[PDB]
């Protein structure tokens, strides 16, 4: 009946002064816009149908046309920025926010979805949705004693749209909006649905992707132990944003980093640093590099958790971008650690895989590695053991690399090499 109408027929029905004819044509537009292969969003926009869809959002006495136009506008808003802007330009934001309080759950849910697409376009539309007042009625939909009484799909859509209000960074969402959203986010982070959990972690990862004061707003809410638990989940869609949130937090202060350690996060890293998904391994190793950039007592916790052998492992074999994070983790370690912690690094076998990576063409990973060797040599000078390290570097073919890096396009790489040759290989 409403399957595969031409746009011309849709316009004809929507432009009739017959509400039932408009309903039929609107549903036909919805089905057109619902197909997978190239829905004709632009043809629908060019026919001038968005203002009519938006006015149908307000037809309280015909809830079916509210639903059909909400769905049609949702799918237009799901397209390019220009296509989303056309929905916004038609006045859809206040009309969708008014539908959040609809007694029809399926209409309210569709308005949640539509605002998620609009907010998800970028910071400006996100903040415009916030200025029109979306947050209060969105949160009111989740003000229930037990989240489990809400329909699963409804709860997932609410969580996803909330995460888009937490997303994007130039600028970050308004501080007061984040403060307003966070207690509901914390409650969603303890829900048992894996999709709600994944999108809740994503939202937290966005909020911690910023300056230390942004991290602190999240960390003060006590979520770190729950993030560490989710870090151990078997669902990769949960581990990935949980790890990104944890990695964001350890870019903050040493005190914020300590809350991650206190929560037991380091005990998960044997798995994460050998995880078969290469980007988990990379994110986990980046996280390690920001922990080894901390206090000596935090470096010591890395040691105690047996994580240095795992760093030797990723340095020895891993995709190259993970090995770069591992090199950073080692140089950070050698820059802040004690003599004993640096000596322990050599005893674990850091020298040979570190020398092997000097063959890379990445100029900055060589600067990073050269810095680490200089730091390890400085620890060796305090124990009179500079030679024993020189023989070890030369026995694994390292000396050949540093003496060959005496011919590099980068000036600082050349000079760091010859200084190591000058001072420890005479």
């Amino acid at each position: 009946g409403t399957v595969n109408w031409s746009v011309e027929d849709i316009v004809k029905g929507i432009n009739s002064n017959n509400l039932e004819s408009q309903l039929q044509a609107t549903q036909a537009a919805r089905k057109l816009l619902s197909r997978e292969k190239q829905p004709p969003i632009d043809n629908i926009i060019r026919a001038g149908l968005i203002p009519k869809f938006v006015s149908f959002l307000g037809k309280t006495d015909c809830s079916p046309i509210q639903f059909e136009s909400a769905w049609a506008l949702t799918n237009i808003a799901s397209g390019t920025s220009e296509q989303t802007k056309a929905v916004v330009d038609g006045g859809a934001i206040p009309a969708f926010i008014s539908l959040l309080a609809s007694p029809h759950a399926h209409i309210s849910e569709q308005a949640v979805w539509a605002l998620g697409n609009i907010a998800g376009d970028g910071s400006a539309f996100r903040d415009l949705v916030i200025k029109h007042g979306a947050i209060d009625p969105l949160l009111a939909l989740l003000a229930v004693p037990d989240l489990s009484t809400l329909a699963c799909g409804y709860l997932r859509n609410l969580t996803w749209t909330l995460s888009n209000l937490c997303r994007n960074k130039n600028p970050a969402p308004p501080l007061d909006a984040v403060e307003q959203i966070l207690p509901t986010l914390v409650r969603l982070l303890h829900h048992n649905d894996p999709e709600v959990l994944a999108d809740s972690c994503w939202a937290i990862s966005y909020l911690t992707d910023g300056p230390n004061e942004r991290i602190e707003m999240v960390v003060k809410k006590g979520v770190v132990p729950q993030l560490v638990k989710l870090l151990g989940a078997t669902e990769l869609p949960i581990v990935t944003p949980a790890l990104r949130a944890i990695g964001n937090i350890v870019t903050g202060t040493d005190e914020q980093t300590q809350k991650v350690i206190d929560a037991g996060a380091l005990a998960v890293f044997p798995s994460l640093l050998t995880n078969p998904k290469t980007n988990i391994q990379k994110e986990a190793t980046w996280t390690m590099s920001n922990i080894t950039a901390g206090r000596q007592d935090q470096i010591q916790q890395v040691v105690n958790h047996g994580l240095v052998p795992f760093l030797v492992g990723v340095l020895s074999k891993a995709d190259f971008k993970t090995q770069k994070e591992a090199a950073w983790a080692i140089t950070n370690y050698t820059s802040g650690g004690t003599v004993e912690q640096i000596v322990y690094l050599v005893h674990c076998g850091i020298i040979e895989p570190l020398m092997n990576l000097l063959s890379a063409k990445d100029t900055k990973i060589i600067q990073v590695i050269l810095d680490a060797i200089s730091n390890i040599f400085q620890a060796a000078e305090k124990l009179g053991e500079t030679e024993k390290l020189s023989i070890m570097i030369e026995e694994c073919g390292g000396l050949d690399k540093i003496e060959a890096l005496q011919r590099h396009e980068n000036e600082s790489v050349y000079k760091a090499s010859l200084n190591l040759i000058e001072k420890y290989f005479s």
Partner: peptide, 10 residues
């Protein structure tokens, strides 16, 4: 992140 926007096909 996961998708910025979501299309509803049903």
């Amino acid at each position: 992140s996961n998708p910025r926007k979501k299309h509803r096909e049903d």
